Amino acid sequence: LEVLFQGPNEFETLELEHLLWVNITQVKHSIERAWTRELKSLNLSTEKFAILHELMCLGGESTPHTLARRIVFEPHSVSAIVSRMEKDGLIIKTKDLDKKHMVRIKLSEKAIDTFYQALEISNRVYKQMMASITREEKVELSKTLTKLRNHTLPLTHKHTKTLTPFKYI
């Protein structure tokens, strides 16, 4: 009954470390896709929401260099996203007085109101997405991911990042 010579080939067995990269990539994609659709009426991408969040931790105002240091993304990516947010009335850029060529970036009241709304929806989205894993699995998942982050980030970010020390209770 079973056809011959059709079954998976050797490229379907991976080193476990390679399978973990596949698993990270797939989870990142499936969560982002579902979250992005729930948040469509606020017009946010995951990176725009990240930048709103980071600026909120910085009190709503900062400079491109301080923001870039606090967040994982590349500075050129961050500057492109910030310009798009500026176009959309989310970010106000002002020439620092006297400090020539230095820019200040500030969330508008619209951005802050959007962040309010998007944070409350996002909490609900991530909680329903992760309801199938236990509190203990969640704690361990953050510990292992944090180890991976701490061992890999310095391979290409040499003192250029001081990532926001997020906590949970």
Ligand X SMILES: Oc1cccc(Cl)c1Cl
Tokens of 12: 């379907």
Helix (H), strand (E) at residue 51: helix 46-57
Helix (H), strand (E) at residue 103: strand 103-107
- For residue 83, the tally of other CB atoms under 10 A from its CB is 12
60-119 residues in contact with a second copy (CB under 8 A) are 72-74
> Can you tell me the distance from the alpha carbon of 119 to that of 44, in angstroms, rounded to the nearest whole number?
11
**Residue 46, beta-bridge partner list:** none
Stretch that binds a second copy, among 80-88, 92-100, 103-111, 140-148 (CB under 8 A): 140-148
When binding is defined by CB under 8 A, the residue of 4, 131, 158, 162 that contacts a second copy is 131
Stretch that binds ligand X, among 20-28, 37-45, 100-108, 152-160 (CB under 6 A): 20-28
Are 61 and 109 in contact, with CB atoms under 8 Å apart? no
Nearer to a second copy, 95 or 113 (CB): 113
Min dist CB 128 to ligand X, Å, is 17
When binding is defined by CB under 8 A, the residue of 7, 100, 132, 158 that contacts a second copy is 132
Q: Does 50 bind ligand X (CB under 6 A)?
A: yes
Stretch that binds ligand X, among 1-9, 46-54, 101-109, 142-150 (CB under 6 A): 46-54
Min dist CB 32 to ligand X, Å, is 9
Q: Return the one option of ligand X, a second copy, none that residue 129 interacts with (CB less than 5 to 8 A, by type).
A: a second copy
CA distances from 91 to 87, 99, 127 (A): 8, 20, 29
- Discontinuities in the chain (C→N > 2.5 Å), after residue: none
In the block, residue with structure tokens 């990269």: 21
When binding is defined by CB under 6 A, the residue of 39, 68, 71, 91 that contacts ligand X is 71
Interface ranges with ligand X (CB under 6 A): 21-22, 25-26, 46, 50, 53-54, 71-72
